[PDB]
Design an enzyme around this catalytic site. Structure first.
Site, PDB file in Angstrom:
ATOM      1  N   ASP A   1       0.474  -0.973   0.326  1.00 32.73           N
ATOM      2  CA  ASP A   1      -0.013   0.183  -0.133  1.00 32.73           C
ATOM      3  C   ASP A   1       0.727   0.985   0.308  1.00 32.73           C
ATOM      4  O   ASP A   1       1.311   1.292   1.284  1.00 32.73           O
ATOM      5  CB  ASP A   1      -0.438   0.133   1.169  1.00 32.73           C
ATOM      6  CG  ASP A   1      -2.407   1.127   0.808  1.00 32.73           C
ATOM      7  OD1 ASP A   1      -2.062   1.917   0.664  1.00 32.73           O
ATOM      8  OD2 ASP A   1      -2.975   0.509   1.279  1.00 32.73           O
TER       9      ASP A   1
ATOM     10  N   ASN B   1     -12.448   6.237  -2.023  1.00 32.49           N
ATOM     11  CA  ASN B   1     -12.282   5.639  -0.204  1.00 32.49           C
ATOM     12  C   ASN B   1     -14.033   5.773   0.272  1.00 32.49           C
ATOM     13  O   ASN B   1     -14.515   5.195   1.148  1.00 32.49           O
ATOM     14  CB  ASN B   1     -11.693   6.298  -0.342  1.00 32.49           C
ATOM     15  CG  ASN B   1     -10.083   5.206  -0.340  1.00 32.49           C
ATOM     16  OD1 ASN B   1      -9.635   3.743  -0.414  1.00 32.49           O
ATOM     17  ND2 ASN B   1      -8.571   5.247  -0.109  1.00 32.49           N
TER      18      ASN B   1
ATOM     19  N   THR C   1      -6.543   3.770  -2.336  1.00 32.65           N
ATOM     20  CA  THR C   1      -6.163   2.090  -2.063  1.00 32.65           C
ATOM     21  C   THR C   1      -7.450   1.519  -2.617  1.00 32.65           C
ATOM     22  O   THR C   1      -7.380   0.233  -3.630  1.00 32.65           O
ATOM     23  CB  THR C   1      -6.110   2.439  -0.264  1.00 32.65           C
ATOM     24  OG1 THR C   1      -5.516   2.772  -0.463  1.00 32.65           O
ATOM     25  CG2 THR C   1      -5.487   0.767  -0.310  1.00 32.65           C
TER      26      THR C   1
ATOM     27  N   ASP D   1      -0.459  -0.714  -4.497  1.00 32.85           N
ATOM     28  CA  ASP D   1      -1.714   0.102  -5.507  1.00 32.85           C
ATOM     29  C   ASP D   1      -1.495   1.549  -5.875  1.00 32.85           C
ATOM     30  O   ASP D   1      -2.346   2.104  -6.385  1.00 32.85           O
ATOM     31  CB  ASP D   1      -2.852   0.371  -4.267  1.00 32.85           C
ATOM     32  CG  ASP D   1      -2.700   0.376  -2.678  1.00 32.85           C
ATOM     33  OD1 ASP D   1      -1.548   1.590  -2.962  1.00 32.85           O
ATOM     34  OD2 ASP D   1      -3.323   1.280  -1.655  1.00 32.85           O
TER      35      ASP D   1
ATOM     36  N   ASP E   1       2.339   2.800   2.799  1.00 33.27           N
ATOM     37  CA  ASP E   1       1.164   4.408   2.768  1.00 33.27           C
ATOM     38  C   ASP E   1       1.465   4.555   3.975  1.00 33.27           C
ATOM     39  O   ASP E   1       1.529   6.047   4.383  1.00 33.27           O
ATOM     40  CB  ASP E   1       0.132   3.511   3.076  1.00 33.27           C
ATOM     41  CG  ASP E   1      -1.230   4.414   1.862  1.00 33.27           C
ATOM     42  OD1 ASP E   1      -0.444   5.367   1.653  1.00 33.27           O
ATOM     43  OD2 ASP E   1      -1.808   4.627   3.229  1.00 33.27           O
TER      44      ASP E   1
HETATM   45 ZN    ZN Z   1      -3.437   2.186  -0.841  1.00 35.56          ZN
HETATM   46 ZN    ZN Z   2      -2.487   6.722   1.545  1.00 36.15          ZN
END
Ligand code: ZN
Ligand code: ZN
Ligand SMILES: *[C@@H]1O[C@H](CO)[C@@H](O[C@@H]2O[C@H](CO)[C@@H](O[C@@H]3O[C@H](CO[C@H]4O[C@H](CO[C@H]5O[C@H](CO)[C@@H](O)[C@H](O)[C@@H]5O)[C@@H](O)[C@H](O[C@H]5O[C@H](CO)[C@@H](O)[C@H](O)[C@@H]5O[C@H]5O[C@H](CO)[C@@H](O)[C@H](O)[C@@H]5O)[C@@H]4O)[C@@H](O)[C@H](O)[C@@H]3O)[C@H](O)[C@H]2NC(C)=O)[C@H](O)[C@H]1NC(C)=O
Ligand code: SKV
Ligand code: NAG
Ligand code: CA
Ligand code: CA
Ligand code: CL
Ligand code: CL
Ligand code: CL
Ligand code: CL
Ligand code: CL
Ligand code: CL
Ligand code: CL
Ligand code: CL
Ligand code: CL
Ligand code: CL
Ligand code: CL
Ligand code: CL
Ligand code: MG
Ligand code: MG
Length: 792
Positions: free
Chosen positions: A115, A174, A153, A302, A255
């Site tokens: 991520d 998201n 993501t 991602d 992330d």
């Molecule tokens: Zn992500």
């Molecule tokens: Zn993020």
């Protein structure tokens, strides 16, 4: 009811209590899930004292002689206890075929997803990430992989799983509001658990539908990464009737550390080390179980990560009077809607106007979603608000101003932005050995994952065959689509007297009546159509028209060309239009009056002018220039758009020829009134030139091709091709271009680069198929057609 037990069913692949991957997220685990299944005692590593221990059920993982049979050893057990080497310490060795145990039917696939792993983090290399680096250098890798917009993501993970743009799969952010459900989706809470949000067919379903067993791809956040790996490894020792063939590991790292410290903070080393350790545990674990030369491993991110701080925030309250009556989805993009319904005060046009070009260096641009670059594919979903703000890299947009700033990074920007690019590595028997491949789009991977598992992919946005060059063995052999409509080749039939189109031209000096061979093929195809005629993939009627300087496929249904093809050599010159010809339009004696445009329609339409697909400026002689003024070369253009189109034709085509050792150009119209990325049927076309049946394009395209080896001219290229393409919005104003009051050399090229496109995007929008006759293989051509010239 949680009074049930997890005894002997931890992480099973199956009202009653759960013991599975996601039970924690659904708050549905049995009472003893934590106790029996999330065991942490003594950590994740065998120590030298623990070798040959008597088995304790309290331990997270085991170092007893039975563990290898039971499939629950700590991953370093053979290294510590049996003197083996770590997988990373072994030399790179080609895997020429899958070395799987008895009763494996196909090589398994493990997807290791991370991520916010920026492409540039791979430049840290073996000093920081030795396992990842061995995977990268031994296997198949690209310099980067392109995510989908928005670079967040959930849209990307689900795009990876389905092969679908977010507008098709339904996870458009998201956070989302669906006005038909009247419900809001978020990362937090239970709304996201409703099936209605999740469209398309993800890989685990495709596999299951076709008899190929899948492990659960996502993991509840509280399950430690070491346990996720151990679980996958245990599943791989299951009997044939239970054992999955496809698996995924997911990590939330790196992330958050990116958000907190920025993509180039020194603090990023630690998370990258921790990720590599987990990869190491997987690879060691595979090696213990004799699966290290059996499974395909994909390491994939991602999206990337950009420098963003609090001081780089634009506020809508500086542009709009009433920010209390709107709802903004903020950050690295903006989506705007009315907070409440039936608010007669709400005025979308006035909102966009107030957000348009109010200061130099304004760090966002508003767009109606249909006007966003077509390369984003971000319009055809009712969860995408009409009003969208593209935010400049490194900036945020927020509603109003309302301490220390805690973030230094973020993501979500335009998917062509360098900082947003992420990672791809493919390692194992089916991937190529020590092979670099060009950057590609994350939408393409689903087809590849399906190929790796022997599966027929569900309909998706990949171009199946475009990544055949990643693989040692290709099960899928792509086939070129069948031409639906065959061309007509009309010869010279009509007298100039037969036409009453309301057009005029000073053309009595022309020798058309004298010229017996007028508009015969001659040398036209050889010089101007270098890659074969485009195939028309829908039912229609069209004519191939030859001229000295260009060839066209003229639609008798739309009364204009679907495509116009011409070659401009490196030393081609530009000539102006003489005064007596500025408003010249000439009837085409091959084409019936009844399937020709008329000039009176343009004269009566006070909003609409016309331009030409082949530009008179690039005529090879004064005589030849008269062909460029044919009614069959004419297309409807707004005056505003003519500023763009004229600059492109007059200045930029010749620039490109000069830079690329000649170019071949194919230009044409696009009709996409319902913004679905797909060629419109006649019913969908919503605008015509006043009083006529001449439809108005939503966009104009061009595909500009030359030789990758720029020392060879475009018309004499032996090898790979080089392509760049665009899809320009056919708009009645230039409000998108804040510097459009200046000379076109100060803004048109910038506009065009923003609207760069893939040949494949034009194919969907036109139902044409390009590059059908070349010296290249068809998979090579599919790669070519998926290429995006980003200008980064
Ligand atoms: Zn992500
Ligand atoms: Zn993020
Ligand atoms: C990128 O690839 C996409 C996939 O090829 C292309 O999208 C597809 O476009 C075609 C042509 O317009 C659409 O075809 C019409 O379909 C109508 C029936 O649609 C309904 O059934 C679909 C099939 O359902 C079965 O099969 C799938 C496996 O593929 C299973 O997953 C299903 O469970 C089922 O067994 C179904 O896929 C389709 O899905 C959409 O609608 C639901 C809501 O009901 C959403 O949850 C989901 O996200 C999809 O919405 C998207 O598409 C609809 C259009 O249908 C849009 O309005 C929406 O905004 C969103 O984009 C649905 O349930 C049929 O009546 C017509 O005669 C046509 O055959 C496909 O529906 C569409 N598929 C998908 C997944 O989007 C896309 O064009 C392409 N893009 C480019 C630029 O080339
Ligand atoms: C989480 C979501 C993005 C999705 N994952 C992936 O696309 C995914 C993709 C890859 C990759 F290889 F392609 F890169 C690797 C790993 C992955 F995980 C996914 O797994 N599902 C869809 C959502 C899902 C579950 C299954 C669903 O169908 N329905 C009805 C839900 O309610 N789901 C949620 C959604 C969120 C959840 N949080 N905790 C529990 C949750 C359950
Ligand atoms: C647009 O801004 C002007 C001030 O320049 C203001 O008077 C008007 O109310 C604004 N309209 C909207 C919709 O924000
Ligand atoms: Ca359309
Ligand atoms: Ca402007
Ligand atoms: Cl949780
Ligand atoms: Cl096998
Ligand atoms: Cl929202
Ligand atoms: Cl308002
Ligand atoms: Cl929908
Ligand atoms: Cl073929
Ligand atoms: Cl004359
Ligand atoms: Cl027809
Ligand atoms: Cl040339
Ligand atoms: Cl002349
Ligand atoms: Cl004009
Ligand atoms: Cl070269
Ligand atoms: Mg005239
Ligand atoms: Mg006019």
């Amino acid at each position: 009811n949680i009074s049930g037990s997890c005894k002997g069913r931890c992480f099973e692949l199956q009202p009653d209590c759960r013991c599975d991957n996601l039970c924690k997220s659904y708050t549905s685990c049995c009472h003893d899930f934590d106790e029996l299944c999330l065991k942490t005692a003594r950590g994740w590593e065998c120590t030298k004292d623990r070798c040959g221990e008597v088995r304790n059920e309290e331990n997270a993982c085991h170092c007893s002689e039975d563990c290898l049979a039971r499939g629950d050893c700590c991953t370093n057990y053979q290294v510590v206890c049996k003197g083996e080497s770590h997988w990373v310490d072994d030399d790179c060795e080609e895997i020429k075929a899958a070395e799987c145990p008895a009763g494996f039917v196909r090589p398994p696939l493990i997807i290791f997803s991370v991520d916010g792993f920026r492409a540039s983090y791979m430049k840290k290399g073996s000093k920081v990430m030795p396992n990842i680096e061995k995977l990268r250098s031994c296997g198949t890798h690209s310099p980067y992989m392109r995510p989908v917009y928005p670079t967040k993501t959930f849209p990307n993970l689900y795009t990876l799983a389905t092969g679908l743009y977010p507008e098709s799969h339904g996870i458009v952010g998201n956070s989302m509001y669906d006005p038909v459900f009247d419900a809001t989706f978020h990362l937090r809470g239970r709304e996201k658990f409703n099936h209605r949000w999740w469209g398309g067919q993800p890989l685990w379903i495709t596999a299951t539908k076709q008899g190929v067993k899948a492990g659960t791809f996502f993991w509840s956040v509280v399950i430690p990464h070491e346990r996720r790996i151990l679980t996958i490894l245990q599943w791989l020792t299951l009997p044939d009737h239970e054992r999955p063939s496809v698996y995924a590991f997911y990590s939330e790292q790196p992330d958050f550390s990116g958000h907190k410290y920025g993509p180039f903070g020194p603090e990023m080393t630690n998370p990258l080390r921790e990720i590599d350790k987990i990869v190491g545990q997987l690879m060691d674990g595979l090696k213990q179980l004799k699966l290290h030369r059996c499974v395909n491993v994909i390491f994939v991110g991602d999206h990337g990560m950009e420098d963003v701080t609090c001081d780089r925030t634009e506020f809508l309250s500086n542009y709009l009077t009433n920010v209390d009556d709107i709802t903004l989805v903020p950050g690295t993009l903006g989506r705007i809607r009315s907070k409440f319904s039936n608010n007669a005060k709400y005025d979308p046009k006035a909102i966009i106007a107030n957000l348009t070009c109010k200061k130099p260096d304004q760090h966002f641009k508003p767009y109606l979603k249909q006007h966003l670059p077509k390369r984003l594919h971000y319009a055809n979903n009712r969860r995408i608000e009409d009003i969208h703000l593209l935010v400049e890299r490194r900036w945020h947009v927020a509603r109003k101003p309302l301490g220390k700033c805690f973030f230094q990074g973020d993501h979500g920007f335009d998917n062509k932005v360098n900082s947003m690019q992420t990672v791809f590595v493919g390692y194992g028997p089916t991937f190529k050995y020590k092979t670099k491949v060009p950057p590609f789009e994350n939408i393409e991977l689903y087809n590849v994952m399906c190929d790796l598992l022997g599966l027929k992919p569900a309909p998706n946005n990949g171009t199946h065959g475009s990544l055949n060059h990643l693989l040692r063995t290709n099960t899928f052999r792509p086939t070129m689509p069948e031409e639906v409509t065959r061309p007509n080749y009309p010869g010279i039939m009509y007298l100039q007297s037969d036409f009453d189109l309301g057009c005029t031209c000073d053309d009595k000096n022309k020798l058309d009546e004298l010229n017996k061979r007028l508009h015969t093929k001659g040398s036209t195809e050889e010089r101007h159509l270098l890659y074969g005629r485009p195939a028309v993939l829908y039912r229609t009627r069209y004519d191939i028209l030859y001229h000295t300087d260009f060839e066209s496929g003229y639609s008798e249904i739309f009364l204009m060309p679907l495509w116009t093809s011409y070659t401009v050599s490196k030393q081609a010159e530009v000539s102006s239009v003489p005064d007596h010809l500025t408003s010249c339009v000439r009837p085409d004696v091959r084409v019936s009056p009844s399937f020709s445009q008329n000039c009176l329609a343009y004269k009566n339409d006070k909003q609409m002018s016309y331009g030409f697909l082949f530009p008179p400026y690039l005529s090879s002689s004064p005589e030849a220039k008269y062909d460029a003024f044919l009614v069959t070369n004419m297309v409807p253009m707004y005056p505003a758009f003519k500023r763009v189109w004229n600059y492109f034709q007059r200045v930029l085509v010749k620039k490109y020829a000069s830079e690329r050792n000649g170019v071949n150009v194919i230009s044409g119209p696009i009709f996409d009134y319902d913004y679905d990325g797909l060629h419109d049927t006649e019913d969908k076309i919503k605008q015509y030139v006043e009083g006529s049946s001449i439809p108005v394009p939503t966009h104009y395209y061009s595909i500009i091709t030359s030789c990758l080896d720029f020392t060879q001219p475009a018309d004499k290229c032996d090898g790979p091709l080089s392509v760049s393409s665009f899809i320009l919005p056919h708009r009645p104003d230039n409000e998108e271009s804040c510097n459009s009051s200046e000379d076109e050399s100060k803004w048109v090229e910038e506009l065009m680069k923003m609207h760069t496109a893939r040949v494949r995007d034009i194919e969907h929008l036109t139902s044409l198929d390009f590059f059908r006759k070349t010296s290249r293989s068809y998979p090579e051509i599919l790669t070519l057609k998926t290429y995006l010239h980003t200008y980064e």
